[PDB]
Design a protein around this ligand. Structure first.
Ligand SMILES: NCc1ccc(-c2ncc(NCC3CCNCC3)nc2-c2ccc(-c3ccoc3)cc2)cc1
Length: 164
């Protein structure tokens, strides 16, 4: 059994003094890490909202997560959408405007969380237009929350559904 733990990185809030363009228990953004022979390694990032932990399916792979002294366990997942919810139903209902700029709360493995302001690329699909946020970030940054102006989470770094 892999030893997967989550660690709180910071609060999830829109950053006003944020850098624009592209230079590349408790609510918040958590690093997802598993213990190794050398030490922990960061495989993903997760969002804690309304007592439910949201992350990419590929990061967790369905494995049980250790938070504090309590084991937090999966409730729902979608392998096609690469989404997994722990302890409750999916709580992130936030949608992108389709025109407004967004901030990515990045969590590079071994780097301070930073907010980066960027405009997602818009591409058509059979299920309706979608916004793509792609930047030069490590794989361990996967699941990093993408927030709108209101500060709600509109996507996870990996893919940003837009409703208008
Ligand atoms: N592993 C990265 C990854 C990125 C996007 C998808 C993905 N693939 C296909 C897809 N088709 C749209 C279906 C929606 C349900 N009805 C049938 C069509 N959608 C996605 C995708 C969509 C939204 C998110 C997302 C991220 C954070 O909140 C929602 C993630 C993936 C899968 C993996």
């Amino acid at each position: 059994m892999a030893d997967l733990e989550l660690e709180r990185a910071a609060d999830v809030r829109w950053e006003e003094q944020a850098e624009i363009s592209g230079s590349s228990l408790e609510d918040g953004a958590y690093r997802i890490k598993q213990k190794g022979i050398l030490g922990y390694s960061q495989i993903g990032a997760g969002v804690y909202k309304e007592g439910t932990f949201h992350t990419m399916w590929h990061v967790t792979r369905g494995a049980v997560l250790m938070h504090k002294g309590k084991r937090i366990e999966p409730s729902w997942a979608d392998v096609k959408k690469d989404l997994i919810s722990y302890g409750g139903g999916w709580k992130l209902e936030g949608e992108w405007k389709e025109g407004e700029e967004v901030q990515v709360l990045a969590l590079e493995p071994g780097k301070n969380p930073r907010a980066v302001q960027t405009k997602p690329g818009l591409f058509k699909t059979n299920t309706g237009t979608i916004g793509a946020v792609s930047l030069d970030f490590s794989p361990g940054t996967s699941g990093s929350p993408i927030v709108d102006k209101k500060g709600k989470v509109v996507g996870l770094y990996g893919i940003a559904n837009t409703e208008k």
